[PDB]
């Protein structure tokens, strides 16, 4: 309210389906603020960045202060950006603007500008194993009333071997378009039709693939090939006119500078969790506005419920919003974060409970222990490491 | 949840023009935002009065961003000087109305504090070497860490001349530092008199006495104009008060042509357009000047003391200064100290407006100067 | 020799829609009618010129065209926008409908005299089914037209959904030419609700319907914007009704991003704005496409007919039309036979102003539509 | 093919922190790593012990190249400064284990020596020109050829030390220092300097003019580099060399500055970006751009790193110049060394492998202690760079 | 710890055609082998290493490969060129050959360790019509191989003609994909004869085909040629037999115009150079796919398994084969199984060289054909 010192700073790591990692902060007036800072297949460096370094420097800290402690850390580090440090940043200025937003007694959108919309469109996954297989899973999301749906024929599987996929791009090259001339035919262009590529494609394979896919009007593809350097999206943007999204496993603005202001890029999925939080979400937004390009955060299940109650925040008020993922949460995992957000007909609303809306049941989680579980890798048929 | 029940707008001459917002809601705040444009004062009081207020009316002031994007799109005829005015009034205002419904003052809205302090600088006046430098002491008495140094119903024309200009004001720094050593910053306006090749020139002449800035060296409609000025001094540029919209300067700023964005709270979108461009800069290093002469009001001031403090890429902030009388009519909470100004902490931007005492002052025209050059050629003023 | 301007009056009338006039008079009693109508904001510019303009227009040589346009373009201090561009294209229109009356000759002839015989307009084409436009078409076929354009209080909201447009639209193209070939040019109007490489597909998809043009396609404050569509698509772009300046336009035509630019003589700067963005459009084989809607008010049609009878690199103009009571308010001369206009040949603009029938229809507030998506998001229309 | 059995983490505090990865082969190789990230080790102790170390078991060591592909790629979220630590510990760590069964120093497995040593610059400091002049004296005397002027920076302790900075007092008083310099010791040795990321890019500009009479060897760190183009208005104003990047930990945090030629000397690390395997990349594509090598080697980096970037040093044929910040003694009994120093050159000497020991055993006489970097703030409390 | 050169020999061999040995010998008696041969220009090398680099070779480190390998590159004055780089590459091989066996590793594993489990390889196909072709496919097929290439005394002069090339060959692809289906890699070779709008026509022409690559489009000295064709296709593009260095190169990799590179270790600069150009390659995910014809020695094919084994950003290694004879010569330790070849476990290299059966067959001159067009003007073979 007038000057809210921070008095402690926790991090909780459980695993109620899988892990989170989750930051409270709690001021002297007693009010509590909630960061998600889990990062999928290496939760543990960002537990520690968070318990061993950030968090004894929060203590004491007028909670006011997001943009100087934003700064202070992002800078101070030395060692600047990147995942780990990301995550970590972004899990206080999350618990920091929660905090902010209840001092001020609003719920947390109110403060970034307001509602631009009444809603937040969001889209989900269809699994089968073959057309036939896909194409009921479609018809089943679309029945539970989503507009938007990502077509493709727990991801960090637990073990404390990453599982090994083998990889072929001139088979997935040959048979993807015919998966969507099905769902077209089926269905018609009803629904706003998604396709994720898993980085898998060097770009003159993306501009083909793209080019392949016209007919079938995407609302986008995604992450068609790595994009550390960001000059790779030029071959494919001046081949196809399929949208392009990029950047789940984007930290910074600048991991995506290049990509916005050449215009190569449609969607920028960037997350609160991973890429700055409110603060820095806000904006690589705002600057990919200028270049018409919009937001379309990555929404998994390994960022937590405290995520997606930031997030929904976020997408209501920004502009240029696109889309919100949404894989779902077990019903383990949500008895874990107590929310307030509503899904009605494909589009999702973060509620009117001041901050964020969202809670963490601590007892509760405390009773599920960090369990090891990581990410694939994908080789080719000859053992060569590739892109997952 | 609040509606808007009034929005109305007041022109008073308190010293000077100034056209005042103020939206009211079904709760009880009020929040006020500036509309003030020089010298073409009474369009933006027609814009928000017999366009943009009725259309305010019984809308929900919390949606701060629909709002200003209802009416920066919804106009068809996009930014420009009079839109922009309007549409920064009524989105200062609504930030003002945001701040105290949740009971802050403006900056803890916007990320909290980035600093304890508001740098300022101000203008010494002279007609001579001499007389300059007795008023460059006076200010820096006065406590001024950084300064600018310079020597009715019809524009006042002045006859101006470039080569005059070059010939003689380096000498005039040099004056300056010889005098008073490299202790405060150092600040010059160029007022848009020169071509990019003089500019260069003019730059190259004075990186001895090492200014915090030149500014508006060239008009900038042409952005690609600073190029040559860029390519061939040292000398940190600055620009900006003349614009209403990133557009106005987002190739300057992205080809690293300039080192301070001079845009301001009411000519350039108000506390949301303004946040955006800073954020902009801020990438390419581009740090605040805002603009801050008498021409933008208390209401203004107020604003942009509350951004200046939180903007992490902050430069300095103008302050040309009220008369008694004009304040009067603004009573405010601002702090000033050695120096450096400070918001004060009053919820909202912590500024009133007195509407009796603006009632005894109706609006009395006034013009900017136009220049020209001997020949009579109508010029950059 | 000397034509000092002895009044300059601003009269708003609304025979049907709102008009803004303005009207100078010299001391030889020449009269110069301009029009300064912007839709939606009309009031602002009405006091730009009565409270602001106007009275420094007082006691000058209405000879000085030039100085005049680059006194208040330059002198404003706040440079270019919609208000102040409609006010300072009023004037120039008005000071070259003097001009030419003192010279005894049709406007065109001072511009430097006819390029073609006529001006080939085009006309818009109403229907909410491929069905109904295709009568409109054929309607305004046997009218002579060779150019149509085929489209299927407070400001109304409308919604709109980009991916029903891609989908459908092409279809109408398609019904089009399968009943009435390729024998009259095809335009069409996107209304800026595109993304780039949405506006990129859109135009692939038409490309066997070989448009004159698609206008509009998206946005254009980010002039790169642009570049995305036109790698992709062999269709021609038209843009820029929204523009008031060269400053809007002027990396769209030097990068070749566009084949018509769409600025009129009301909102763009007048006779003089337009000559030079022409021109300049002209180095890069880009023609004129004036935009002209029942918005612009017969003077605008007056003026444009005449420079487009001279202008070399002349495309096409737009005419929505006037209803007999508007026409009523402004008695005219210009011709129409079979598809082509012509401004005619009486001395300068050859249009008058019925004053007093003007003032028996008093403005009448009407605003632009907005358009939203789906979720509410505030859109462009 | 010798198997991996074990891969162990370490954290010592002989003087300061220090991480270090000991890998194990089943015929009892051992290879060392460094992995210190100074201010933030312990996460990268995490990365290792909880999610690296356990997937490198049963691994065939000779399989740098796709352990570094597979720890790289297989984290799905790419470099950064903690997850590059790891990578790069691990790496010089099996480069050890390489040379070794090679029967070899490391720098002949890169291609062999391309010079008899390798020339390093040391610190110089004080609080007064004259001052300087007298540290600057001793080091010359030590036959340092290459010294670095100015006027342990993380302190023990809870919080980070703030520091006072003002750009302009810098601008006005820093090239007098030089003058001095060259004015008593004239132009016989090479002269470093660190901006320490300062100033804005017109800032560095002018500062770089204004020491071009003193022919500095580099200026270095002029302005914050994540904007990479931020170094083209400096470039195109002054003939002073430029050197950057201590801070990065990848080629994607410098590719631009190298391609425009924005850049003479490229900064990067082997504990910090990539390793034997990333620095080998790094430095051939920076010698198509003529961009020499000017490694960082503070003291936050541990003899392990130290002993791989002489062996790198030794071959790479765009060397420019080896910071050499020094080991107190406590720290060099912790770290067994193999490496000679012999007026102003050092070499890495002829053991095989890296050539480098850890005392485990001493080691643990030390709990990590924690210590960070300063942050900067101007006078009004703007959080700076520092 | 010092190995010193005591000898260095070339030897000059055609058992079934033209090599070019060096052998270097070290005074500890570990001995490596260089390929140095340059079809149609071999003796050029077997002079530059006989009479100039050998005997600089004696009495240094072999140990130092990096400074021999910029003592000779810069050293020489005259910078790269085939000849040159031809001997620079035999020595480098052959010290990498020494320092493995030093190491008592096979090279593969002083290079990082293996990437893959075998390094796929492609083959040719002869056939004077579409039948014969088909043919020779399902042989090859059958062979294993997972990647095949389709082709349709004084130097032999032949024929072209680009417009019959545009034509027919389509169909070739078509037939293929038609019978076979899209299990195989399609390889083609174009031989440097369409100019780049043609060659952009070309790779329109068969991208229903997905080819694996298109080769050598366009003679490449001026390495802008390519952008033409990859803005008009998405038919990917390999390029590089001919190179001898990364400077002949570095442009179409990183203006992204290439997705193959070719470069040999015998051509190229060696171990040494190839690393380089495949490290630099894989930034812009530009992929191996060097050069194996029978003109390249069993040394090289063994120099290149080693690489391939290795190296991250591998695409595939040609391989036209070797007469029963030409092996002989040579004896290897290398695999075959399944369409993915193996350097094997041997140390160095793991190759030999029969001197006294190489000094059976002596040098039989043989060169290259010529290309001309119809008109006879000399053409790009
Ligand atoms: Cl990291
Ligand atoms: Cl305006
Ligand atoms: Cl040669
Ligand atoms: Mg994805
Ligand atoms: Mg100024
Ligand atoms: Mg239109
Ligand atoms: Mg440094
Ligand atoms: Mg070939």
């Known amino acids: 309210?007038?000057?809210?010192?921070?008095?402690?700073?926790?991090?909780?790591?459980?695993?109620?389906?899988?892990?989170?990692?989750?930051?409270?902060?709690?001021?002297?007036?007693?009010?509590?603020?909630?960061?998600?800072?889990?990062?999928?297949?290496?939760?543990?460096?960002?537990?520690?960045?968070?318990?061993?370094?950030?968090?004894?420097?929060?203590?004491?800290?007028?909670?006011?202060?997001?943009?100087?402690?934003?700064?202070?850390?992002?800078?101070?580090?030395?060692?600047?950006?990147?995942?780990?440090?990301?995550?970590?940043?972004?899990?206080?200025d999350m618990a920091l603007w929660d905090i902010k937003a209840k001092a001020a007694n609003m719920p947390l959108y109110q403060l970034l500008g307001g509602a631009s919309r009444t809603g937040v469109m969001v889209y989900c996954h269809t699994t089968g194993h073959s057309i036939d297989e896909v194409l009921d899973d479609y018809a089943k999301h679309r029945d539970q009333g989503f507009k938007a749906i990502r077509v493709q024929c727990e991801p960090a599987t637990k073990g404390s071997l990453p599982e090994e996929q083998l990889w072929s791009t001139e088979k997935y090259l040959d048979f993807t378009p015919k998966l969507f001339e099905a769902v077209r035919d089926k269905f018609g262009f009803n629904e706003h039709l998604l396709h994720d590529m898993h980085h898998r494609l060097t770009p003159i394979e993306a501009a083909r693939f793209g080019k392949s896919v016209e007919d079938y009007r995407l609302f986008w593809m995604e992450d068609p090939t790595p994009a550390e350097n960001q000059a790779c999206f030029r071959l494919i943007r001046q081949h196809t006119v399929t949208p392009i999204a990029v950047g789940e496993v984007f930290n910074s603005i600048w991991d995506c500078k290049q990509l916005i202001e050449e215009q190569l890029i449609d969607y920028i999925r960037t997350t609160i969790t991973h890429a700055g939080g409110i603060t820095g979400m806000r904006r690589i937004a705002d600057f990919a506005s200028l270049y018409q390009v919009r937001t379309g955060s990555h929404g998994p299940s390994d960022l937590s419920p405290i995520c997606m109650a930031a997030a929904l925040h976020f997408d209501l008020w920004v502009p240029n919003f696109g889309v919100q993922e949404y894989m779902g949460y077990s019903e383990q995992m949500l008895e874990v974060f107590p929310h307030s957000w509503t899904f009605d007909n494909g589009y999702m609303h973060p509620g009117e409970k001041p901050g964020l809306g969202i809670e963490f049941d601590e007892k509760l989680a405390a009773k599920y222990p960090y369990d090891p579980a990581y990410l694939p890798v994908a080789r080719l048929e000859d053992g060569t490491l590739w892109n997952w």
């Open 1 to 92: 309210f007038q000057s809210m010192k921070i008095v402690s700073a926790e991090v909780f790591v459980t695993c109620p389906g899988r892990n989170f990692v989750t930051l409270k902060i709690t001021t002297d007036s007693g009010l509590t603020g909630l960061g998600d800072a889990t990062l999928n297949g290496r939760e543990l460096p960002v537990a520690s960045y968070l318990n061993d370094h950030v968090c004894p420097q929060l203590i004491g800290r007028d909670a006011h202060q997001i943009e100087d402690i934003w700064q202070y850390f992002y800078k101070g580090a030395y060692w600047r950006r990147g995942p780990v440090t990301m995550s970590a940043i972004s899990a206080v």
